[PDB]
Design an enzyme around this catalytic site. Structure first.
Site, PDB file in Angstrom:
ATOM      1  N   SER A  34      -0.285  -6.785  -1.449  1.00  0.00           N
ATOM      2  CA  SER A  34      -1.712  -7.016  -1.570  1.00  0.00           C
ATOM      3  C   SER A  34      -2.214  -8.198  -0.691  1.00  0.00           C
ATOM      4  CB  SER A  34      -2.010  -7.118  -3.047  1.00  0.00           C
ATOM      5  OG  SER A  34      -3.355  -7.058  -3.319  1.00  0.00           O
ATOM      6  N   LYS A  37      -4.577  -7.585   2.182  1.00  0.00           N
ATOM      7  CA  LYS A  37      -6.035  -7.607   2.004  1.00  0.00           C
ATOM      8  C   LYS A  37      -6.676  -8.756   2.710  1.00  0.00           C
ATOM      9  CE  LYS A  37      -6.017  -4.745  -2.167  1.00  0.00           C
ATOM     10  NZ  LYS A  37      -4.588  -4.692  -2.508  1.00  0.00           N
ATOM     11  N   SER A  97      -9.112  -7.320  -5.777  1.00  0.00           N
ATOM     12  CA  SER A  97      -7.919  -6.786  -5.118  1.00  0.00           C
ATOM     13  C   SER A  97      -7.932  -5.263  -5.243  1.00  0.00           C
ATOM     14  CB  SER A  97      -6.649  -7.414  -5.788  1.00  0.00           C
ATOM     15  OG  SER A  97      -5.588  -7.379  -4.876  1.00  0.00           O
TER      16      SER A  97
END
Ligand SMILES: O=N[O-]
Ligand SMILES: O=N[O-]
Length: 251
Positions: A34, A37, A97
């Site tokens: 993640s 991102k 997220s």
């Protein structure tokens, strides 16, 4: 005497000069998950600054952004055939997220996720992330999706340096979309003894919890990356230690 940090890899960098103050496995490849991102929001930030997209545009949510494609992972909860504003998708990416929101922005920016990925790697290259490669806009696993703590530090630094309007969003603690409120998982934002204003949190399935953080104290600004901690408490504590050491390093 750099302290011991309970993490598989880390880097602590002075934001001003880019100097590495401490590190472990700084240049060894990992799956960033993640934290990918951050690169997505970086590209979005550049597009907003140059005026190619506006924060007020209505973005089409396609089949590929459908919540249905992301079971078991974080989502903004976006629905196919509706539209959502760019500012709202951005916050879904950064604060929540949300993988769904990543794909929707990817498509709004470059038509298809693949072309968005081309821009991601072209930016990664121009930023000096020589040991990073992206395959998608959200971070879900892929043999060819990888980065390093050092590269992730450069990325965090670049966010603050080149896209400040995008970076400001990382200190927002929560965001609500469609009556669903989600909190920013960077718990250090609530620490009163420190001025932590970013950056992004994530998990790499065989390694552990990660955090890319930044903080200020006086005229100092540090960027820290911690990868592979055993639990959310350790992710916060080890980042706080790393950062305090940096503030004390300059003395
Ligand atoms: O609060 N960071 O897990
Ligand atoms: O030199 N002040 O960080």
């Amino acid at each position: 005497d750099a302290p011991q940090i309970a993490a598989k890899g880390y880097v602590l960098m002075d934001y001003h000069s880019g100097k590495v103050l401490a590190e472990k496995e700084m240049d060894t490849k990992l799956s960033p998950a993640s934290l990918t991102k951050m690169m997505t929001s970086y590209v979005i930030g550049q597009e907003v600054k140059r005026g190619n997209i506006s924060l007020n545009d209505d973005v089409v949510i396609s089949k590929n952004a459908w919540a249905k494609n992301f079971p078991d992972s974080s989502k903004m909860f976006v629905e196919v055939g509706t539209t959502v504003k760019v500012s709202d998708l951005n916050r879904g990416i950064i604060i929540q997220s949300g993988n769904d929101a990543c794909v929707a922005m990817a498509e709004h920016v470059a038509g298809t996720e693949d072309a968005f990925v081309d821009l991601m790697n072209a930016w990664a290259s121009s930023l000096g992330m020589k040991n990073s490669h992206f395959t998608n806009s959200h971070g879900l696993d892929d043999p060819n999706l990888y980065s390093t703590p050092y590269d992730l530090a450069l990325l965090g630094q670049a966010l603050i340096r080149d896209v400040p309007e995008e970076y400001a969003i990382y200190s927002e603690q929560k965001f609500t979309y469609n009556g669903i409120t989600q909190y920013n998982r960077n718990g250090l934002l609530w620490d009163k003894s420190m001025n932590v204003d970013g950056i992004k949190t994530g998990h790499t399935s065989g390694a552990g919890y990660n955090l890319v953080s930044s903080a200020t104290e006086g005229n100092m600004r540090l960027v820290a990356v911690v990868m592979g901690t055993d639990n959310e408490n350790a992710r916060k504590a080890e980042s706080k230690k790393l950062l305090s050491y940096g503030f004390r390093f300059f003395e």
